[PDB]
Amino acid sequence: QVPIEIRGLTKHFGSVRALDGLDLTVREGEVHGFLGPNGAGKSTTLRILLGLVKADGGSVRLLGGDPWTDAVDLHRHIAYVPGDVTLWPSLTGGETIDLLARMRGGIDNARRAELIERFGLDPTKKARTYSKGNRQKVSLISALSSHATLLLLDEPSSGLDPLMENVFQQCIGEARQRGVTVLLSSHILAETEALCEKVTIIRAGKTVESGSL
Amino acid sequence: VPIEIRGLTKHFGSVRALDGLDLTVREGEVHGFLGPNGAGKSTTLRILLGLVKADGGSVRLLGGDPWTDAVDLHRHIAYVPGDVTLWPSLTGGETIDLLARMRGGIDNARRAELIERFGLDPTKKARTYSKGNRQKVSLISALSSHATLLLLDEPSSGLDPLMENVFQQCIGEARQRGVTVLLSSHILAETEALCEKVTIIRAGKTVESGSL
Amino acid sequence: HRGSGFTGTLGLLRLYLRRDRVSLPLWVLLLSVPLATVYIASVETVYPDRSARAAAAAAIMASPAQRALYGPVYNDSLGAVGIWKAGMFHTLIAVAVILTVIRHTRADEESGRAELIDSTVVGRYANLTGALLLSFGASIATGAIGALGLLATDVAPAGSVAFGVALAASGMVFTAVAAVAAQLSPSARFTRAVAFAVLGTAFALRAIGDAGSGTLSWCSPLGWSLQVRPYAGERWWVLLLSLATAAVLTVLAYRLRAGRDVGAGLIAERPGAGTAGPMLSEPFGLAWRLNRGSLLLWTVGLCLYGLVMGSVVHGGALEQAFLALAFTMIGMVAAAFAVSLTLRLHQEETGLRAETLLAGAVSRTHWLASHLAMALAGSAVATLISGVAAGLAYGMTVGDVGGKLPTVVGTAAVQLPAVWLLSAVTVGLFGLAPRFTPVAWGVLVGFIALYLLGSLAGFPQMLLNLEPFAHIPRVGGGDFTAVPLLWLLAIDAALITLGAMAFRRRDVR
Numbered sequence: 030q031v032p033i034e035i036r037g038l039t040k041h042f043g044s045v046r047a048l049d050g051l052d053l054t055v056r057e058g059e060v061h062g063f064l065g066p067n068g069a070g071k072s073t074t075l076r077i078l079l080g081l082v083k084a085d086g087g088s089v090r091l092l093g094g095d096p097w098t099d100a101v102d103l104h105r106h107i108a109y110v111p112g113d114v115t116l117w118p119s120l121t122g123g124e125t126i127d128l129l130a131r132m133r134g135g136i137d138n139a140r141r142a143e144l145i146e147r148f149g150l151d152p153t154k155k156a157r158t159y160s161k162g163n164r165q166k167v168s169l170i171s172a173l174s175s176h177a178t179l180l181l182l183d184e185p186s187s188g189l190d191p192l193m194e195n196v197f198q199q200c201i202g203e204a205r206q207r208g209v210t211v212l213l214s215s216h217i218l219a220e221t222e223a224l225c226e227k228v229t230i231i232r233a234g235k236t237v238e239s240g241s242l
Numbered sequence: 243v244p245i246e247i248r249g250l251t252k253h254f255g256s257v258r259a260l261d262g263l264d265l266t267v268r269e270g271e272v273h274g275f276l277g278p279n280g281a282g283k284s285t286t287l288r289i290l291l292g293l294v295k296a297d298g299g300s301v302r303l304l305g306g307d308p309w310t311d312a313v314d315l316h317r318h319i320a321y322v323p324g325d326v327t328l329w330p331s332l333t334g335g336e337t338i339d340l341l342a343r344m345r346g347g348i349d350n351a352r353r354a355e356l357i358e359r360f361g362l363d364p365t366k367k368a369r370t371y372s373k374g375n376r377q378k379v380s381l382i383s384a385l386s387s388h389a390t391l392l393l394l395d396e397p398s399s400g401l402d403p404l405m406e407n408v409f410q411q412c413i414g415e416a417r418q419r420g421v422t423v424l425l426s427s428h429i430l431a432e433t434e435a436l437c438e439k440v441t442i443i444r445a446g447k448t449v450e451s452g453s454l
Numbered sequence: 455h456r457g458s459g460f461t462g463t464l465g466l467l468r469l470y471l472r473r474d475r476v477s478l479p480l481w482v483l484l485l486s487v488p489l490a491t492v493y494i495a496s497v498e499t500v501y502p503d504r505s506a507r508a509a510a511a512a513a514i515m516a517s518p519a520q521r522a523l524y525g526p527v528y529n530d531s532l533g534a535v536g537i538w539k540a541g542m543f544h545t546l547i548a549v550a551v552i553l554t555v556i557r558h559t560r561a562d563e564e565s566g567r568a569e570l571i572d573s574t575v576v577g578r579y580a581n582l583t584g585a586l587l588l589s590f591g592a593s594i595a596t597g598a599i600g601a602l603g604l605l606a607t608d609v610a611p612a613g614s615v616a617f618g619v620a621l622a623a624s625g626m627v628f629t630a631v632a633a634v635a636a637q638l639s640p641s642a643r644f645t646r647a648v649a650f651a652v653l654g655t656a657f658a659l660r661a662i663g664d665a666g667s668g669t670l671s672w673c674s675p676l677g678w679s680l681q682v683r684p685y686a687g688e689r690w691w692v693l694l695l696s697l698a699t700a701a702v703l704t705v706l707a708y709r710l711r712a713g714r715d716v717g718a719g720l721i722a723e724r725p726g727a728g729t730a731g732p733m734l735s736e737p738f739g740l741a742w743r744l745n746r747g748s749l750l751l752w753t754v755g756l757c758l759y760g761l762v763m764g765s766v767v768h769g770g771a772l773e774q775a776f777l778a779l780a781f782t783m784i785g786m787v788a789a790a791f792a793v794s795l796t797l798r799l800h801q802e803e804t805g806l807r808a809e810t811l812l813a814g815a816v817s818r819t820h821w822l823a824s825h826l827a828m829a830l831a832g833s834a835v836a837t838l839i840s841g842v843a844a845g846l847a848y849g850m851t852v853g854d855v856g857g858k859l860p861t862v863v864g865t866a867a868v869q870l871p872a873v874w875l876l877s878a879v880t881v882g883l884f885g886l887a888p889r890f891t892p893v894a895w896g897v898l899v900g901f902i903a904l905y906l907l908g909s910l911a912g913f914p915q916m917l918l919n920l921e922p923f924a925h926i927p928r929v930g931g932g933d934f935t936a937v938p939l940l941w942l943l944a945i946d947a948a949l950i951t952l953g954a955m956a957f958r959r960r961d962v963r
């Protein structure tokens with residue numbers, strides 16, 4: 030009943046202190062904001078959660094298991110939207126969606142067509158011809174249309190015009206209805222107010238303030 | 243008039259990339275450039291730099307055709323790409339002053355102030371940047387040159403609400419001293435407080451362009 | 455004012471030249487120094503008599519199989535006999551210049567640096583001219599050093615200059631081919647494949663022509679280097695044939711660059727499919743989809759080459775000797791194939807596409823053994839198909855195909871451990887020092903050098919054991935112990951397991 034619970038995390042990248050005692054707690058059904066300045070530790074934490082980086086201390090309990098040792102049984106319920114989206118230049122836009130969603134929980138054909146219709150993507154075009162805004166709709170549609178009880182979105186609306194970033198807000202608001210925990214790491218302080226409550230702010234690896242809005 | 247696009251068109255394959263555009267920028271004014279996610283904005287920016295070859299219409303940049311005078315007009319133009327990629331091996335300072343040497347000009351008094359104001363750390367290998375400090379490299383290398391026409395593609399992407407404010411302040415100072423800017427934003431909070439006489443393109447052709 | 459399409463060439467040249475300051479001196483020296491110090495040097499000890507070289511020169515012109523690989527011998531003079539085995543450098547220099555040109559033009563332009571560069575005051579043809587200047591300079595330097603070295607020996611002075619100029623011209627002919635081929639597709643791999651298909655065709659035509667009448671050896675950029683005929687009466691004018699071609703090719707390359715839209719090539723892309731078929735739902739399926747074209751091309755090329763080396767072989771103590779030497783080259787080429795397939799792991803990771811995959815139901819072994827399995831399977835299939843083709847051709851040209859086919863298939867198959875050892879080395883490097891993964895190529899080249907220059911230079915039989923190609927047994931009659939095969943397979947397994955265990959405890963950054 031607690032998807033994320035981090036206590037005293039720490040991580041050194043050599044001579045750089047990326048994290049110095051971060052505290053975070055999500056409560057199974059809330060859209061948790063994750064704010065912070067540039068160079069604070071907002072991805073590094075997401076990469077520690079997914080098991081791509083080894084923590085130097087503290088305790089992490091993602092969905093009830095270690096993110097590093099149980100990094101397979103837990104990833105059948107997690108959808109990840111990278112900060113900088115990179116795709117395969119030879120695969121079509123409509124094949125990347127199915128390929129990515131077929132390694133996570135599994136795609137939902139009822140929602141895939143609906144999301145392609147309401148985002149206005151073109152699913153028959155090589156992925157090296159996408160204009161940085163349709164390159165993000167691929168990740169967004171592949172993540173929103175899946176069986177996942179936790180979304181680790183990382184700056185999800187980078188490169189979206191003022192109407193698609195309202196369609197995305199509506200989609201998140203509708204996805205949260207059917208009990209889907211969300212962790213939203215963003216810089217635009219206009220979508221966090223509309224979506225998120227109980228925000229947490231980090232400055233230099235340490236949480237400075239937390240709580241509801 | 244630095245920009246005089248008067249009917250530009252471009253087809254890549256069968257994809258109607260650009261179907262008749264009517265941009266017009268004048269001297270010493272900031273000029274927004276808005277539209278949805280397929281309009282043809284980055285393609286117009288590339289065409290103005292002589293990097294995509296227009297397949298029709300008339301383009302006129304600073305008084306000469308962009309394609310044939312592409313080497314001569316680049317002494318007055320600074321470009322900030324939408325997708326910023328840097329040399330992995332080089333450092334921040336090495337990248338900045340290499341791009342300055344290649345363009346044949348910098349302003350060190352402004353460069354040092356920009357580095358201290360954006361908070362960039364000039365001594366880190368470029369591969370160890372958090373993409374927000376990787377946009378700052380392009381911003382510092384463009385705002386500190388002697389160019390008199392900035393083609394900013396999507397500058398404030400990956401910048402927290404403080405460096406975004408610093409960027410707005412720097413653009414204001416730049417416009418005070420004669421620089422002309424053509425800015426594509428997708429953020430309607432900087433367009434309102436920065437520029438006037440915006441231009442909106444829907445499918446390749448302008449739909450509404452005029453004073454804010 | 456004062457603007458030409460070439461403005462900014464010197465700066466681009468000076469930052470291309472500092473990109474590779476450890477590779478260029480090494481491979482310029484490696485193809486020039488061991489001409490007067492190894493090849494010519496070791497002819498006064500193997501053939502230490504005026505009448506002894508006559509027998510060797512007679513045993514070459516009377517065996518098509520041997521002179522298919524190296525070329526003919528036109529007299530018994532010391533220079534002609536000594537430099538005979540050095541007629542392989544015309545292909546290595548071509549490989550080097552092709553790789554350099556593509557690496558500097560298309561490899562970085564595809565990665566997104568063309569927009570960063572061209573938005574500055576650089577000219578349009580600054581990049582192409584920088585790369586061509588670099589490659590032409592390298593192919594001049596190697597030839598000049600080789601000629602200067604050969605001029606210090608007791609051989610005739612005209613022949614040394616002739617060979618130096620021939621090496622330089624063969625280096626220049628294929629730089630233009632690489633420049634033209636880099637303007638074709640927006641993918642570096644396809645451009646390399648097109649550039650190397652031409653070199654493979656040239657080598658095949660050279661071999662077919664020189665194993666017979668010889669009139670077909672005039673239709674290939676290689677061959678115009680052997681008909682200069684150093685130390686046998688020089689045909690100077692044929693150099694024009696190698697110089698009037700590059701100028702025709704280069705002036706085409708620039709033309710293709712005239713209107714090209716930096717980032718593209720010649721043919722616009724085509725729409726694909728909207729849905730993934732029930733095969734692309736796994737790391738294995740995705741890995742196979744990325745590697746269809748490479749496997750098909752490599753298999754077809756190796757089959758076509760084997761179909762020629764198995765036909766010129768017979769116009770038993772020499773047949774076995776030649777068929778055990780014509781397959782070492784196939785082993786080296788297949789090792790290059792294995793390394794190029796295995797480096798796709800490093801290409802994926804450095805492109806931030808490993809995180810997107812490992813943030814799912816994929817462990818850091820079901821992903822590794824999706825490119826490793828392809829590297830171990832494609833090379834084996836290519837080598838076995840080439841062996842079958844060569845054996846079938848040899849049996850057909852003898853008269854019975856049911857007897858020699860098993861022997862030739864075994865001879866081709868016993869190369870596999872020394873082909874998989876290079877994949878093992880690359881995977882072991884990816885897991886300890888990921889940044890230093892592309893040095894595997896260097897290792898491979900080292901082995902090749904130690905195979906060619908090792909025995910001739912008189913190295914002790916303990917520094918010559920440090921390569922796997924020297925340990926492979928002989929199939930046919932005796933001389934088969936199968937002990938080195940077990941040791942090589944054990945070494946492959948140890949390297950692979952160390953590389954896999956060192957990847958499971960690491961940060962994917």
Ligand SMILES: Nc1ncnc2c1ncn2[C@@H]1O[C@H](COP(=O)(O)OP(=O)(O)OP(=O)(O)O)[C@@H](O)[C@H]1O
Binds near residue numbers: 157160258259279283
């Ligand atoms: N290299 C290319 N080849 C073919 N089609 C392309 C290429 N680049 C872009 N396109 C297509 O042509 C049009 C041009 O897109 P463009 O780059 O102008 O979009 P954009 O307005 O920059 O998007 P965004 O505003 O989100 O950055 C789009 O339909 C795009 O998919």
Ligand SMILES: Nc1ncnc2c1ncn2[C@@H]1O[C@H](COP(=O)(O)OP(=O)(O)O)[C@@H](O)[C@H]1O
Binds near residue numbers: 371372
């Ligand atoms: N590979 C790395 N090498 C060095 N420092 C790194 C590396 N990865 C991350 N860091 C450091 O981690 C800190 C936080 O990075 P990140 O989480 O991306 O920042 P942000 O909070 O802006 O998202 C920064 O100080 C950054 O330099």
Ligand code: VO4
Binds near residue numbers: 399401
């Ligand atoms: O450096 V960032 O806060 O754009 O991940």
Ligand SMILES: [Mg+2]
Binds near residue numbers: 071072112372
């Ligand atoms: Mg980040």
Ligand SMILES: [Mg+2]
Binds near residue numbers: 161283
């Ligand atoms: Mg754009």
